[PDB]
Symmetry: C3
Subunit: 334 residues, 3 copies
């Protein structure tokens, strides 16, 4: 029935985002994406703790999909026979059938093709949701990502002015529940199925062992720090499919923030810390003013420093002594 | 002193809401309500776990009271001699005397009549609050509900347009703290008083055993699913008197959301997930576009699927293939 | 370089706030503050539990600093040799160098002078952040306060009208993690260093033993209740540097609330309960209408009544029977 142009997208792994237009002169298209599910044992911390992950496209989070209002998003979801469990996909951006979940349940060896019309603007979670107790389990095992539905005119500040980002990053935050043995050491398991009973018991107590960005402690640091230059406006999309978070850019601000993540609402301005409700994505833009290292955290600092939820930015440019200066370096008290 | 017309309301059990006008041509009235406290042992899950509940009018939540701005709400609170504890009522909608609590403490065998002027619009929690450590205990035992204070012109979108709902439901969410024995089984108690010491010990650790809507796992499912038709605008009032929640309609959206719950503020539009602060009520309206089953959850999915916090809607009407379609059903991967 | 007038401020202990102008005709100044760090063992509850606190200026929270937009805030941070640990300061109001943290690390015996330009309006957290796991530890040991950056025209309601407070209070909320021995009694330690291992173990489990205002259970009660008169507009700044909170004035409202705390955004109106994201300050103003006692709580009532997070207001003036009246005092049920 649907006679619109088709456009394929090559997804890229987080924190990066596939190339896209903000404002566009294109009309509605059918935008084609493929997600291939991978169950895999991964390392989640610098001590070598392992984790039975379940992923879209091999990553935690799943990749960010970007379209415009009124596009149709046509996703081929693939569950190779090398996996063990059924899986599906629920898009919080979509209308009907439990977000798509009720139309996309696939066993290992199967694939399905779902299309949904992007009638709601903003950033949105997508996640697996097979049914019943498997819903939380698949999500906290890593099976969640996000989609961004941009207005065709790009972003605005609510107050007729355009808001154009120079780059966008996607920070997916994951609460993880790794049980401990009697000794006190994290357990390892041979399969997701084998991990389930201990992992569910822990899940129901509502305290994660790890809270990470991009799948691992320290993922968005070192060589893989986020980057910017003084003068660049950076959009940071943050999602959390199961649990609240409170993002904060240490040494910066949220110049324009959509903490509930939906572009039909004006952004708030000049925030210190914002709030991502579990089950949502939000977005914050900041124009960097100072060079150096920044930390991007959830501002439960226990979670940030001790459980894994810290990213860095390395920013190049000229220091601004008007905005901040060390008037007197550390010295003995007179 | 107060020479206004009197109108009696027949309260109805949640999730339903007593009949009322949205926009009205009536002026201020004294609106009369009666709440009769019932302490009772109830079943809270499908395994037969019991719970020492304390209720207004026999239900968890207490019933939704609906009035208009500038009405006077005159409540007869009754504590029959068949109860064991003193009780009172605090309305977050009311001004003075700890919300009414300091004027309504009644022993078993007593009743009291409180009137308050509805000067604040929105949805608001009401709850018992006897004093000291009894405050949390009575609330988490079930002694909380909500009141809705509508503008006389009905609801609006902030942007001069009216927002009329076709039906309203009240979802009261309850965090419950049921201790376990050494075996690991939930305990049962012969009285609220007997439950108190174990229950307080658990409460202070801040992790509920159950998180339920309408008093029980599965209460708002099966025969008792919420209902709608495609085309109907449904208002969903959600309250949580003690603990945060993050509502989400799976397969839908919040078209217009007052997450802080107060009609003097414009609603936000197009939300995926919203946030009910513990100690508050909020409200979301959605116009259904697709038939079928929806789940209405808190989007801590552990809480939703594993601890009790899932409701269903069953929606009738015609499927819209433009909004969503299964392009290719599950098939073997080529 | 910077040729502006200098003004010294004499800080005062919370909940009070040093004298300041709301609207001002002054232009930018260099506003001088001194903070002297004190590590000390303190009592945190009415049972005599002790706690290894780390403070700015001897108090939990640290004192509220008040300036205007475009001022330069020049802080002399002093770490006397009588302390044991290095410390620094991070201002969420400031731009660059991890909020100042990367320019203010001082060993015992040292001081440093940092200046930052107040380019963002609102209330903001400041806290110590030495590095790594020490960050959460120093914060939850008490090393956090707030700064308020007022517009030069004072506050407004977003809707061209001025919002002038008659008084302001600063409520700093502190999550504390005091371990227990095998007996079940809270432990005491001889130094912060000695407390660290047990305290970190507890911290990572994310459940505080105490949640207090102004450093201690009951601090803002009795002789030290907050006060007001009927007719007075009171601004209540609330901060939480590590963990969410949900403030509520029992028997009142938030007439004008900036829950995210930033004056570039209009306030919300008529709230029952608001939300302070961990890592932030927010503010609420209320004009008292009724005399008597009010409780100001976080509306996790377990935290409020059982873990320490309750303040009182004692309000003088004439009772308003129009707003609320006890129509019939407690009596036997007919
Ligand atoms: O930023 C969204 C916010 O801005 C307003 C104007 O105050 O509308 C702008 O954004 C709409 C969505 O992109 C545009 O359709 C509109 O033309 C533009 O003025 C608000 O209505 C909206 O909530
Ligand atoms: O929806 C409330 C929001 O809308 C505004 C207009 O932007 O005011 C509308 O709602 C008021 C409350 O019902 C009415 O009194 C007013 O006449 C109407 O325009 C905002 O002022 C308000 O925050
Ligand atoms: O309260 C802030 C809110 O109000 C608006 C007007 O709707 O702007 C007022 O506040 C600004 C900041 O103080 C002033 O510069 C402006 O002149 C005044 O109208 C909004 O723009 C702002 O979000
Ligand atoms: O701003 N530092 O957590
Ligand atoms: O949208 N599903 O949790
Ligand atoms: O309003 N009382 O918690
Ligand atoms: Cu899955
Ligand atoms: Cu979901
Ligand atoms: Cu009671
Ligand atoms: Cu209350
Ligand atoms: Cu310190
Ligand atoms: Cu910080």
């Amino acid at each position: 029935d649907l006679k619109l142009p088709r456009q394929k997208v090559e997804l890229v792994a987080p924190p990066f985002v596939h190339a896209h237009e903000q404002a566009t002169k294109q009309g509605p298209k059918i935008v084609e994406f493929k997600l291939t599910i991978e169950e895999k044992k991964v390392v989640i911390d610098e001590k070598g703790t392992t984790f039975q992950a379940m992923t879209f496209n091999g990553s935690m989070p799943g990749p960010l999909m970007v379209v415009h209002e009124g596009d149709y998003v046509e996703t081929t979801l693939v569950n190779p026979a090398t996996n063990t469990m059924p899986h599906n996909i629920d898009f919080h951006s979509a209308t009907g059938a439990l977000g798509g979940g009720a139309l996309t349940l696939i066993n290992p060896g199967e694939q399905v093709v779902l299309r949904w019309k992007a009638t709601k603007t903003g950033v949105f979670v997508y996640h697996c949701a097979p049914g019943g107790p498997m819903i939380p389990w698949h999500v906290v095992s890593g099976m969640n990502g996000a989609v961004m539905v941009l207005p065709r005119d790009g972003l605005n500040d609510g107050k007729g002015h355009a808001l154009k980002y120079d780059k966008v990053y996607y920070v997916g935050e994951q609460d993880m529940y790794v049980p401990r043995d009697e000794k006190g050491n994290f357990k390892s398991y041979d399969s997701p199925g084998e991990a389930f009973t201990d992992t569910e018991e822990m899940m129901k107590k509502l305290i994660p062992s790890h809270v990470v960005f991009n799948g691992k402690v320290g993922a968005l640091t070192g060589k893989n720090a986020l980057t910017a230059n003084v003068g660049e406006n950076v959009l940071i999309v943050h999602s959390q499919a199961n649990r609240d978070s409170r993002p904060h850019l240490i040494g910066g601000h949220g110049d324009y923030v959509w903490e509930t993540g939906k572009f039909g609402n004006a952004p708030e301005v000049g925030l210190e810390t914002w709030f991502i409700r579990g089950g949502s994505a939000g977005a914050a833009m900041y124009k960097f003013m100072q060079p150096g290292i920044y930390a991007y955290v959830t501002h439960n600092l226990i979670e940030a420093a001790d459980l894994g939820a810290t990213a860095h930015f390395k920013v190049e440019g000229k220091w601004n002594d008007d905005l901040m200066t060390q008037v007197k370096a550390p010295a003995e008290i007179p």
